[PDB]
């Protein structure tokens, strides 16, 4: 059918040409809850609405502050590599956190004492590369498709510092001198960046491991997120990875959230910092409570970016018949939330009653245990 922006005796049929397919994806935007109110910034953007850079070996498309201006501190890239294909050795100012959605890949990273780390990363796995440290990605036999997040929203995928591009812009005599070789021994250096390129599949991980005079790195740069025990509640699971368990991940705290059909991520806020969200699969709606009686509801599905400014109240409700699976990202060294339910459960009942104009029948239902994901009764 054809949705109309009508709610009871409010609204009207659309009369100008329109985008029906988008209206259908945004039922809570075309027809908001009556409890929404006031101007709130846009907190929703689709990777489908971005230009896709296509290379031999895959593609990369980004959502930045230039697309979603609210998110000044965090930007993201959806990257894809075909089997064996290489993301060129490179570096950047920003720290890089990543979630492997499809496939498997090998990463390399050398730190500032010249200690190397090389490791294979599967679906549900993370990596974190501290600011400025050089790294690579090479997909294995299935290829790889993954979400990268960078701790500056000004990030630009096109402006990474790359091995070949650096050498292509360094005088040949300096390069020769740096390495102790002749200009002729290096005449075949690429004249421009590679960025992403087809390459033969590598061998087994163990034959790549590079021994060095400098030691093993003190903390791993990868993390098996889905191998951890999750917080289980009635309608879903939550896997948390931050600087307290994923030790190198100093500037990025993360959670993977699974919400079953008919369940929701409960009403909570984050007392530490802004939340950046990516919707891996499923269909959701969320309301951002902005104080001063301002609130606005957004709809999300696979490939959408969401955002919740520091301390604003929210929930994320699965509104489809498949599991809702999304990531919660924070630029901080820990994950923290305050749950509406737990908060009220931990105060005197008559006090809460004074506040809400409700009785024992309500405060009796409060739970002092925190359940990040609840099921509808």
Tell me the C-alpha distance between 258 and 240, whole Å.
12
Give the torsion through C-alpha atoms of 69, 296, 300, 128, to 10 deg. Answer: 50
* Other residues' Cβ atoms within 10 Å of the Cβ of residue 195: 21
Q: Are 242 and 253 contacting, i.e. CB atoms less than 8 angstroms apart? A: yes
Q: Nearer to its own copies by C-beta: 237 or 265?
A: 265
Region of residue 39 (phi > 0: left; psi between -120 and 50: alpha; otherwise: beta) = beta
Residue 191 contacts which entry, its own copies, Mn ion, none (Cβ below 5-8 A, type-dependent) = none
Q: Which stretch binds Mn ion (CB under 5 A): 36-44, 195-203, 273-281, 296-304?
A: 273-281
Residue whose entry in the numeric block shows the structure tokens 């599905």:
301
CB of 228 to its own copies, least distance (A): 19
Annotated binding residue 294: no
Residue 169 assigned ligand-binding role: no
58 binds, among Mn ion, its own copies, none (CB under 5 to 8 A by kind): its own copies
Contact call for residues 149 and 97 (beta carbons, < 8 A): yes
Q: Does 154 bind its own copies (CB under 8 A)?
A: no
Find the length of the chain: 377
Residue 49 found at the interface with its own copies (CB under 8 A): yes
Distance CA 198, CA 84 (A): 7
Residues 233-252 that bind its own copies (CB under 8 A): none
Nearer to Mn ion, 159 or 214 (CB): 159
Q: Tell me if 51 is assigned to a ligand binding site.
A: no
CB of 143 to its own copies, least distance (A): 7
Q: How far is the CB of 275 from Mn ion (least distance, A)?
A: 5
Does 89 engage in binding with its own copies (CB under 8 A)? yes
Structural contact between residues 331 and 290, judged by C-beta atoms closer than 8 angstroms: no
Q: Residue written as tokens 């991520």?
A: 265
Give me the least distance between CB of 52 and Mn ion, in Å please.
18
By CB under 5 A, the residues from 177 to 196 that bind Mn ion are none
Is 168 one of the binding residues for its own copies (CB under 8 A)? yes
| Binding-residue pattern over the window 55 to 84 for its own copies, x denoting contact by CB under 8 A | xx-xx-----xxx-xx-------x-xxx--
| Site for its own copies contains 355 (CB under 8 A) | yes
**Residue 342 backbone dihedrals phi, psi, to 5 degrees:** -60, -40
Tell me how far, at minimum, the Cβ of 239 lies from its own copies, in Å.
Answer: 18
Question: For its own copies, which residue of 122, 230, 250, 340 counts as binding (CB under 8 A)?
Answer: 340
11 or 271: CB nearest Mn ion: 271
Does position 104 interact with its own copies (CB under 8 A)? The reply is no
- Measured in degrees and rounded to the nearest 5, phi and psi for residue 117 equal -135, 130
Q: How many residues bind its own copies (CB under 8 A)?
A: 176
All residues at 6 or more sequence positions from 355 whose CB lies less than 8 Å from its CB, including other chains: none
By annotation, the residues acting in catalysis are: 328
Using alpha carbons, select from 1, 21, 4, 20 the residue that is nearest to residue 12: 4
* Nearest distance in Å: CB 90, Mn ion: 6
Phi, psi of 22 (to 5 degrees): -70, -40
37 labeled part of a ligand binding site: no
306 vs 43: CA distance, rounded Å = 5
Q: DSSP string of 60-104?
A: EEEE-TTT-TT-SS-EEEEEEE-TT-EEEEEE-SS-EEEEEEEEE
How many residues bind Mn ion (CB under 5 A)? The answer is: 2
List the one residue from 141, 183, 189, 219 that touches its own copies (CB under 8 A): 189
The stretches of 115-260 forming alpha helices (DSSP H) are: 163-168, 172-179
Site map 317..336 versus its own copies, x via CB under 8 A: x------------------x
Radius of gyration of the chain (CA): 24
**Positions that interact with Mn ion (CB under 5 A):** 96, 275
Q: What residues are designated binding site for Mn(2+)?
A: 90, 92, 96, 135, 268, 270, 275, 314
């Amino acid at each position: 059918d054809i949705p109309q922006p009508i709610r009871g005796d409010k609204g009207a049929t659309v009369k100008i040409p329109r985008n029906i397919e988008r209206d259908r994806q945004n039922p809570d935007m075309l027809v908001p809850p009556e409890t929404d109110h006031g101007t709130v910034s846009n907190m929703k953007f689709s990777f489908s609405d971005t230009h896709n850079r296509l290379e031999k070996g895959g593609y990369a498309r980004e959502v930045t502050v230039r697309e979603l201006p609210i998110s000044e501190n965090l930007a993201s890239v959806n990257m894809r590599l075909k089997p064996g294909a290489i993301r060129e050795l490179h570096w950047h100012k920003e720290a890089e956190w990543a979630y492997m959605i499809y496939g498997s890949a090998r990463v390399t990273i050398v730190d500032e004492k010249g200690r190397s780390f090389i490791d294979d990363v599967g679906e549900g796995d993370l990596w974190y590369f501290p600011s400025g440290l050089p790294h690579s990605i090479q997909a294995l036999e299935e290829g790889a498709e993954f979400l990268l997040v960078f701790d500056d929203g000004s990030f630009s995928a096109n402006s990474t510092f790359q091995l070949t591009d650096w050498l292509a812009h360094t005088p040949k005599e300096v390069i020769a001198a740096n390495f102790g070789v002749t200009k002729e021994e290096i005449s075949n250096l690429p004249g421009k960046e590679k960025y992403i390129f087809e390459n033969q599949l590598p061998g087994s991980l163990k034959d790549d491991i590079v021994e060095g005079p400098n030691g093993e790195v003190p903390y791993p740069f990868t993390y098996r997120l889905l191998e951890q025990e999750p917080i289980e509640s009635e309608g879903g699971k939550v896997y948390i990875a931050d600087s307290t368990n994923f030790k190198v991940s100093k500037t990025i705290a993360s959670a993977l959230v699974t919400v079953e059909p008919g369940a929701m991520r409960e009403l909570h806020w984050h007392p530490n910092t802004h939340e950046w969200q990516y919707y891996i699969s499923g269909k959701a709606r969320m309301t951002v409570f902005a104080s001063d009686g301002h609130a606005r509801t957004f709809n999300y599905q696979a490939g959408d970016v969401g955002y919740v400014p520091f301390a604003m109240g929210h929930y994320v409700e699965n509104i489809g018949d498949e599991p809702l699976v999304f990531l919660e990202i924070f630029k901080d060294d820990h994950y923290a939330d305050v749950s509406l339910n737990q908060w009220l459960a931990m105060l005197p009942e008559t006090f809460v009653q004074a506040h809400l104009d409700l009785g024992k029948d309500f405060t009796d239902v409060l739970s002092k245990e925190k359940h990040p994901v609840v099921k509808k009764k």
